[PDB]
Amino acid sequence: TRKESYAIYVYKVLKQVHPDTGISSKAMSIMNSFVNDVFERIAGEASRLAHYNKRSTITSREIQTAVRLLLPGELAKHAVSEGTKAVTKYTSAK
Amino acid sequence: TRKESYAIYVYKVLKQVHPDTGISSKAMSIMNSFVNDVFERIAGEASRLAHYNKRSTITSREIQTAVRLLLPGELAKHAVSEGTKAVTKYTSAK
Amino acid sequence: AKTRSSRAGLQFPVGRVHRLLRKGNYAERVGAGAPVYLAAVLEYLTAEILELAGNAARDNKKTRIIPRHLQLAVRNDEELNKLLGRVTIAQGGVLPNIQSVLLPKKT
Amino acid sequence: AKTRSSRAGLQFPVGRVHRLLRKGNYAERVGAGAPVYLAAVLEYLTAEILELAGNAARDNKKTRIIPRHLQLAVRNDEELNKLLGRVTIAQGGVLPNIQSVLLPKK
Amino acid sequence: PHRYRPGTVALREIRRYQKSTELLIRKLPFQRLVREIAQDFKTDLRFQSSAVMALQEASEAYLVGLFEDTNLCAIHAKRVTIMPKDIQLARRIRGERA
Amino acid sequence: PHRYRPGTVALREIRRYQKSTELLIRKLPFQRLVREIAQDFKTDLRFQSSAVMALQEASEAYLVGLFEDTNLCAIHAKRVTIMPKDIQLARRIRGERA
Amino acid sequence: KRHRKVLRDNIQGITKPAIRRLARRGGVKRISGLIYEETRGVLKVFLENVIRDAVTYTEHAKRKTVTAMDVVYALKRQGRTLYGFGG
Amino acid sequence: VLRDNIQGITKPAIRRLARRGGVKRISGLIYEETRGVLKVFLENVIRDAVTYTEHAKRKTVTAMDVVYALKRQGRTLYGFGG
Amino acid sequence: LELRLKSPVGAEPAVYPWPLPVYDKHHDAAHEIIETIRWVCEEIPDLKLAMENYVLIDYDTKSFESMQRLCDKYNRAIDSIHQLWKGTTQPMKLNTRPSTGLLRHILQQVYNHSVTDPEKLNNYEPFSPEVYGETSFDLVAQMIDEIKMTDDDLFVDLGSGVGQVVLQVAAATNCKHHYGVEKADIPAKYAETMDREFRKWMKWYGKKHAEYTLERGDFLSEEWRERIANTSVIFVNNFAFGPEVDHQLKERFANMKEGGRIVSSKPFAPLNFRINSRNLSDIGTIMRVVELSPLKGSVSWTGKPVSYYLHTIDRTILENYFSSLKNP
Amino acid sequence: MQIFVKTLTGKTITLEVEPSDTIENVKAKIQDKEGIPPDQQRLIFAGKQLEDGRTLSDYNIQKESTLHLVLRLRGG
DNA sequence: AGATTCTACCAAAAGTGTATTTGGAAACTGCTCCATCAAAAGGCATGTTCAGCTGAATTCAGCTGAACATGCCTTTTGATGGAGCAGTTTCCAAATACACTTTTGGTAGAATCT
DNA sequence: AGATTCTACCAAAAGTGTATTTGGAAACTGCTCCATCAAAAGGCATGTTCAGCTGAATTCAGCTGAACATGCCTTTTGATGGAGCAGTTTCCAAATACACTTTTGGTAGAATCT
Ligand SMILES: C[S@@+](CC[C@H](N)C(=O)[O-])C[C@H]1O[C@@H](n2cnc3c(N)ncnc32)[C@H](O)[C@@H]1O
């Protein structure tokens, strides 16, 4: 039964940042754990945010506030800009 | 908008254990926080448990395991008996 | 008719707890016995804390439980203290406890 | 048809992130931009750690990132260290660090 | 003129405060500190009075518990006087600065 | 007969172990310990190999970080030798004892 | 709305006697003179952290008033769950 | 010669852990203290792991049971799934 | 009577009105007086020798009587200097630059004489192009020592405030023009006046000033996009101007061609940024970022210096990254 | 038909194009050899912005002409 | 030994198209409660004096731990039957979905208790 | 002053009653990968010697606690304007809900590469 992971996407990012750098299996498994962990923290925080405000919907806005609550200073600022940029780009496309 | 609280149920139980003892509003507020807190903790542990096992249903069995994970020794034992008893009785009444 | 609480022999509201479980987005489905079991546990834990807090109140010659009594009950009980190890009870104060070396004299 | 990831200009899978959000029981509904924003955040954080990890592999004269490098990158970075303050990176070891008072009196 | 020896009244104060539960920081001064800090984060905020009391109950519980740990650190060093290094060790072990 | 002074080799080992990442407890003995503890919770259990390894990676990282805090406590008391009371102080402040 | 006095140096409102009292509740018998400033600095960090998150919840809800619940949620997020204020 | 299992966590293994932890000199009493601490750590984590094992109706403790146990104990571990 | 301090190179005297103008309890007219004379005695020895006579050295800031003797002798000394310089003695040259200690006094007087109510400057809502951040004498000095302003530069201060950064720079250095534009109604009105008090006083001490205009205008105006492209020294305050404000500025900076410098309260991209064009927000891909030396003249509410960053445009780096991939 | 494409590091890369070639094909030729993204690439000649989908004949790009490649950033 | 490249297979996803459903924004507004000014006064904060006794320094000797040489037993490594972890198929107890009908926890306002 | 004592109103609950849907227990089973054994393999246990660390004993400068005089500013009691939180109705932009076509990530096996 299929076992999904972020491995292939982590690898694509690695190549963008360090074209001639590889990553071992154990390291990749660590990165997969990292992505799943941050996904759960951000999602849980967004979930609580919507419930606190009695909203049925988790939108980009709850994801944004979740990011500002969870990530340290500079990391939050860049994550927010990266997220905003992607939703802009995405929204502007037939 | 009506705001619910476990106050009347806390009071009923208070009367069962200590018939002539009352409770101040601030202590009742603390008891209401306690009940909500444990409800969320147990419910969250149950949710994760069900997800970990790819189950879309939270049954009394997930609540029981959540209770065992969350509560210290003797409290878990007694909580387990009381919940089991309540379900066996519930299911016998219909 | 009869409440699900009466059928289960509980004081806590099974109906309410079932509803709260559904609204909380814990799972796609919530079985009928879940809220019964949960209400029972919540009721049991509240009976336990009120039993001890009413005793602390009696110990302090009071008839009304206040936050300090809830705190004395929780902090003097090993298991409740652990369950509430990261919880602050407002207006609870702390347990009297002076480290030995700080006392005067000797022997 | 163009993948939502490509439309967003992302490497991470928007479609999968949307799916994971829906089935994670986080909310009854999930708006369209949420999985895009979240995927972008996950991609960015991933790039940040791989960027510093790769640098650590380099300093160590290695071309392949192993757990040690992820640990060195995270623990030497103030922000990543706090984000992962309660996380243990398997096979990571610790940062070289000896309390000064323990050094010999040269 | 009568004089209790140094430490006697200190011990008396410990027993008195460990017996009570009222907040120990003056209320208005604490409210101004909260407003000053909040204002530097975001201008024009208002506060429910219970929001300020909640911050005060939490801040005092936090400080009392930190002084307990600090005290243990001083005693560990064979002292009975708490010092900045005891608070720092306590916060470092707690992971507040680690 | 050459002889390094007390401490010289200790320092050498600190440098060596802080550079590496391999586990420091031997596997089989750790596995036996794990199985024995688990048998008290449920008899006749099996363990995936990765389950024991995860427990060892977590257990070792826990002890190593605890030793770091223990060391700060011994140093706080002006010693360079860790003692049981240092581990106890660290655990109490971490809230593992508290 | 006309004027609104400038808030400054209110950390000094956390006085030496108040800090002494808090240390007494914490079982402390003797206190170095440097403790007061150290404690103010620690309290400021604690408050900045909780207030930052509380206000973040306030802004997200598009309110201008920080509620007891914004503080309770902020405290909970930080692992300092507080009972007694709706939380 | 027999051997109590917890004694299998030897003085040398404990010293190595201590070295990685930056420790230069060790009291003889540290070894037993450490064993006691490690046992409590394993009891707490294994108890929860086994609770997940049993809930899943399994007879085999999986890495995931351990990962979930560590996570709820505030000891999140990366590298073994999840 | 009034109090006049007669120009030491006979050009546009300083006049202080009667009754004395008190701004706050840290600035009165008299204290400015004492500092002006102090500096002129230090510029010209012969006047110092003379100020000793007829002044008992018992003068004070809060009584007129005490000031009226100090001015009268001083004015009597200035008449002696012009007769001295009218003969065979050579006077001072008006092509001299003011020292740091003197220049500090001149900017301080010009503020006080314009701004007669500082509270109004403190009026701001944050995350807006109107935050009047704390700018210091010292911060502008780090700027003047560290990068050197030449006639092959142009200075523009976007969000100028009163405009004390531009004016300080003009007394000390010279460029083709120096500009200051700030959007806020309140600081602009003050800035116009500041320019006037500043020009009257530079000529009063006989010191060359550079060309400047402090303007009422919007610094984010689309008019500036082409002007910025031709401007190779940008100072831009961004104390808490907000990300939104910052972004729009990052788009406009792109229009600068190489050798430009941008001093801002923040990195636009890391000091230790990796080259490879990846950013979809940052323009700090064509420019190296390094920290200008920390302050003690600005102190935030946190109680730690406010740091400032120097960015130097060198697109040579991005282009080289690409070049490496074509080799071997 | 020969062209030089100048970066401001004073590097000229020669491309062998024909005048029938679009701007979009040219930028693809620059990407092949230096790994440069088209959107970030702004080819300017004679104070005209060479816009994608335009033959080279249109901009009077002939043999041994120097086109200026200025970058920009973009994204979004 | 473990990471990389490549061919082949395909249920699982994910994207597009169609129609219905609905959360929650703007719009208007009732009404709580927050900020603020007032006045009074005493609970406490401030600042000082004085000296008790604590922290910090110095000295020193017992003895515990570190370093190390000497020798074997527990651990590590590699090979092999099955205990069950999983993938598949079957099937109903039990969980949505939906329309009423009835019961009950809040709560607004006034009154007397404890 | 705060709490438990009643009256009346009731929308939001909670419960009772058919129809329809389906999650996952249960049974059978194939394929892992776990437990266990044999032997090739790499520390650990143990006693000796003494360096240097811990902690006891001693001393004293001066910090910090205790007590006190003085009076500031927090606390308390009240009132009031109105910012803004929160209730109510309207109504579309965006989400859920299938149904269908396409692409894609994961898995398995083979073999070369680093
Ligand atoms: C921190 S103050 C500057 C103080 C002065 N520049 C200094 O360095 O001391 C920032 C100024 O930026 C101005 N500002 C913000 N956005 C602006 C815009 N778009 N155009 C012009 N000025 C703007 C504000 O009005 C504010 O006075």
Closest C-alpha among I211, I170, I167 to residue I191: I167
Diameter of chain B measured on Cα atoms: 49
Q: Is I251 annotated as a binding residue?
A: no
Both tokens assigned to C53 = 């807090």
How long is the CA A16 to C1' L105 vector, in angstroms?
20
> For chain A, how many structural domains are there in total?
1
Sign of CA dihedral I189, I194, I195, I200: positive
φ, ψ dihedrals at G29, nearest 5°: -100, -30
Closest C-alpha among B7, B13, B11, G82 to residue C48: B13
Q: Which chain B residues 42-61 have CB under 7 A to strand L? A: 50, 54-57
How long is the CA I3 to C1' L84 vector, in angstroms?
55
Beta carbons of F62 and H75 less than 8 Å apart:
yes
How long is the CA A94 to C1' L93 vector, in angstroms?
17
> DSSP class of residue I299?
B
Both tokens assigned to I193 = 């006046």
Q: Give every CB contact of residue I86 below 8 A, 6+ residues apart in sequence.
A: none
Method for this entry? cryo-EM
Q: How many residues does chain C have?
A: 107
Q: Is I198 annotated as a binding residue?
A: no
> D-chain residues within 8 Å CB-CB of H21?
94
CB I158 within 8 A of CB I211: no
Min Cα–Cα distance to chain G from A36, Å: 19
User: For residue I258, what is the enclosing H or E element?
Assistant: none
Q: Is I110 annotated as a binding residue?
A: no
CB D55 within 8 A of CB A79: no
Both tokens assigned to C11 = 């004081």
φ, ψ dihedrals at I226, nearest 5°: -75, -35
> DSSP class of residue D47?
H
Q: Give every CB contact of residue F31 below 8 A, 6+ residues apart in sequence.
A: F47, F52
Q: Is it the case that chain B and chain I have 3 or more CB pairs lying under 8 Å apart?
A: no
Q: How many angstroms separate the CA atoms of H42 and F31, rounded?
A: 11
Residue I276: is it exposed, middle or buried by C-beta count within 10 angstroms (0-12/13-18/19+)? middle
* Strand L closer than 7 A to residue E15 Cβ: no
Q: Give every CB contact of residue C63 below 8 A, 6+ residues apart in sequence.
A: B20, B21, B22, C57
User: For residue C93, what is the enclosing H or E element?
Assistant: none
Beta carbons of H22 and D88 less than 8 Å apart:
no
Q: Is it the case that chain H and chain A have 3 or more CB pairs lying under 8 Å apart?
A: yes
CA of H55 to the centre of ligand 1 (A): 63
The residue segments making up the domain with residue H19 are: 5-82
Query: Is residue I274 less than 8 Å (CB to CB) from chain D?
Result: yes
CB J63 within 8 A of CB J1: yes
Determine how many CB atoms are found less than 10 A away from the CB of residue H79.
27
Beta carbons of B26 and G84 less than 8 Å apart:
yes
Alpha carbon distance, N-terminus to C-terminus of chain D = 71
Q: Is I206 annotated as a binding residue?
A: no
In 3-state terms, what secondary structure has residue I87?
coil
Q: How many residues does chain J have?
A: 76
* Strand L closer than 7 A to residue F20 Cβ: no
How long is the CA A41 to C1' K29 vector, in angstroms?
39
Bridge partner list, I309: I264, I291
Mutation to probe ligand 1, out of I128, I219, I236, I251 (largest number of atoms < 8 A from CB):
I219
In 3-state terms, what secondary structure has residue A1?
coil
Closest C-alpha among D97, D45, D91, D95 to residue D68: D91
Q: How many angstroms separate the CA atoms of E31 and E39, rounded?
A: 12
Q: How many angstroms separate the CA atoms of G31 and G22, rounded?
A: 12
Q: How many angstroms separate the CA atoms of I174 and I263, rounded?
A: 18
> DSSP class of residue I288?
E
Q: What percent of chain E is helix, strand and coil (3-state, nearest 5)?
A: 65, 5, 30
Diameter of chain G measured on Cα atoms: 49
Q: How many angstroms separate the CA atoms of A50 and A9, rounded?
A: 29
Resolution of the coordinates, Å: 6.8
Q: How many angstroms separate the CA atoms of C12 and C37, rounded?
A: 11
Domain residues of chain J, as ranges? Answer: 1-76
Return the C-alpha torsion angle I88, I94, I96, I101, nearest 10: 100
How long is the CA G9 to C1' L23 vector, in angstroms?
62
User: For residue F86, what is the enclosing H or E element?
Assistant: helix F84-94
Return the C-alpha torsion angle I78, I84, I90, I93, nearest 10: 10
Q: Which chain C residues 4-33 have CB under 7 A to strand L? A: 4-5, 13-16, 18-19, 29
CB D83 within 8 A of CB A72: yes
> I-chain residues within 8 Å CB-CB of A82?
280-281
φ, ψ dihedrals at G80, nearest 5°: -125, 40
Closest C-alpha among D28, C83, C35 to residue B43: C35
CA of I211 to the centre of ligand 1 (A): 21
Both tokens assigned to I264 = 């801002």
In 3-state terms, what secondary structure has residue D57?
helix
* Strand L closer than 7 A to residue D102 Cβ: no
Q: How many angstroms separate the CA atoms of F81 and A88, rounded?
A: 59
- Estimate to the nearest angstrom the gap between the alpha carbon of E26 and the chain centroid: 12
Q: How many angstroms separate the CA atoms of J23 and J31, rounded?
A: 12
Q: Would you tell me which residues 22-81 of chain B have a C-beta closer than 8 angstroms to some C-beta of chain C?
A: 22-24, 26-27, 30-31, 34-35, 37-40, 42-44, 46-47, 50-51, 55-60, 62-64, 67, 70-75, 78-79
Q: How many angstroms separate the CA atoms of I319 and C59, rounded?
A: 81
> For chain G, how many structural domains are there in total?
1
Q: Give every CB contact of residue I120 below 8 A, 6+ residues apart in sequence.
A: I186
Query: Is residue H76 less than 8 Å (CB to CB) from chain D?
Result: yes
Q: How many angstroms separate the CA atoms of D93 and F62, rounded?
A: 12
Query: Is residue F83 less than 8 Å (CB to CB) from chain D?
Result: no
Best residue in C20, C25, C26 for a mutation probing chain A (most A CBs within 10 Å)? C25
- What distances in angstroms separate CA I284 from CA E63, F48, I253, I268, one per listed residue? 44, 50, 10, 5
The domain covering F8-94 belongs, at the CATH homologous superfamily level, to: Histone, subunit A (1.10.20.10)
Closest C-alpha among F73, D15, C38 to residue B41: C38
> DSSP class of residue C87?
E
Best residue in A29, A34, A35 for a mutation probing chain H (most H CBs within 10 Å)? A29
Strand C29-30 and strand B57-58: pairing?
Answer: parallel
Q: Is I241 annotated as a binding residue?
A: no
- What distances in angstroms separate CA I244 from CA A71, C27, E6, I220, one per listed residue? 20, 39, 60, 12
CB B76 within 8 A of CB B67: yes
Q: Which chains touch J (3 or more CB pairs under 8 A)?
A: A, I
For residue I19, cis peptide bond before it (omega within 30 degrees of 0): yes
CB C72 within 8 A of CB E18: no
- What distances in angstroms separate CA I86 from CA E5, F51, I5, one per listed residue? 83, 100, 20
Place of tokens 């940040």: D48
Beta carbons of D26 and C25 less than 8 Å apart:
yes
Q: How many angstroms separate the CA atoms of I125 and G4, rounded?
A: 13
Q: Is I273 annotated as a binding residue?
A: no
φ, ψ dihedrals at H25, nearest 5°: -140, 135
CATH code 3.10.20.90 for J1-76: yes
CB I156 within 8 A of CB I179: yes
Q: How many angstroms separate the CA atoms of D35 and A43, rounded?
A: 10
Sign of CA dihedral F39, F42, F43, F48: negative
Both tokens assigned to I307 = 């740091």
Q: Give every CB contact of residue I162 below 8 A, 6+ residues apart in sequence.
A: I111, I114, I115, I121, I187, I190, I191, I194
* Strand L closer than 7 A to residue E39 Cβ: no
Domain residues of chain C, as ranges? Answer: 4-93
Beta carbons of E40 and I301 less than 8 Å apart:
yes
Q: How many angstroms separate the CA atoms of I326 and I322, rounded?
A: 7
Q: How many angstroms separate the CA atoms of H27 and H33, rounded?
A: 10
Strand E46-47 and strand G65-66: pairing?
Answer: parallel
Q: How many angstroms separate the CA atoms of H20 and I100, rounded?
A: 55
Closest C-alpha among E40, D12, C44, I166 to residue B86: C44
Ligand 1 binding pocket, CB closer than 6 Å: I 129-133, 135, 157, 159-161, 164-165, 181-184, 187, 218-220, 237, 239, 241, 245
Closest C-alpha among D10, B47, B43 to residue D18: D10
* Strand L closer than 7 A to residue B26 Cβ: yes
- What distances in angstroms separate CA I126 from CA D67, E43, I131, I133, I243, one per listed residue? 43, 7, 6, 10, 11
Atom of ligand 1 nearest to the CA of I239: 1
Beta carbons of A30 and H81 less than 8 Å apart:
no
User: Ligand 1, atom 8: nearest CA belongs to which residue?
Assistant: I135
We report the CATH number of the domain holding residue G44 as 1.10.20.10
Pick from J8, J36, J72: which is nearest to I322 by CB?
A: J36
Q: How many angstroms separate the CA atoms of I212 and I162, rounded?
A: 13
For every residue of J11-56, DSSP letters joined together read EEEEEE--TT-BHHHHHHHHHHHH---GGG-EEEETTEE--SS-BS
Q: How many angstroms separate the CA atoms of F68 and F81, rounded?
A: 12
How long is the CA C1 to C1' K101 vector, in angstroms?
11
> DSSP class of residue D82?
H
Segments in G1-87 forming alpha helices (H):
16-25, 35-60, 68-77
Residue of E nearest to F79 (CA): E77
Residue of D nearest to I275 (CA): D51
The residue segments making up the domain with residue B65 are: 1-94
In 3-state terms, what secondary structure has residue I53?
coil
Beta carbons of E44 and I301 less than 8 Å apart:
no
C-alpha triplet I115, I117, I122: angle, nearest 5°: 95
Convert A29-40 to b/e letters by CB count within 10 Å (16 or more is b): bbbbbbbbbbbb
Both tokens assigned to I296 = 């003690």
Q: How many angstroms separate the CA atoms of I159 and I156, rounded?
A: 10
- Estimate to the nearest angstrom the gap between the alpha carbon of I133 and the chain centroid: 14
Strand F46-47 and strand I22-24: pairing?
Answer: unpaired
How long is the CA J15 to C1' K59 vector, in angstroms?
86
Q: Is I155 annotated as a binding residue?
A: yes
Residue H74: is it exposed, middle or buried by C-beta count within 10 angstroms (0-12/13-18/19+)? exposed
C-alpha triplet G1, G4, G5: angle, nearest 5°: 165
C-alpha triplet I258, I262, I263: angle, nearest 5°: 155
Return the C-alpha torsion angle I42, I44, I49, I50, nearest 10: -110
For every residue of B35-76, DSSP letters joined together read HHHHHHHHHHHHHHHHHHTT-SEE-HHHHHHHHHHHS-HHHH
Q: How many Cα atoms occupy the beta-carbon half-sphere of I215 within 13 Å?
A: 13
> B-chain residues within 8 Å CB-CB of G85?
29, 33
Diameter of chain F measured on Cα atoms: 55
Q: How many angstroms separate the CA atoms of J64 and D3, rounded?
A: 42
Residue E75: is it exposed, middle or buried by C-beta count within 10 angstroms (0-12/13-18/19+)? buried
Q: Which numeric CATH code is attached to D4-93?
A: 1.10.20.10
Best residue in H24, H77, H78 for a mutation probing chain D (most D CBs within 10 Å)? H78
Closest C-alpha among I182, I127, I185 to residue I160: I182
Q: Where are the beta strands (DSSP E) in F18-91?
A: 46-47, 81-82
Classify domain E47-98 at the CATH class level: mainly alpha
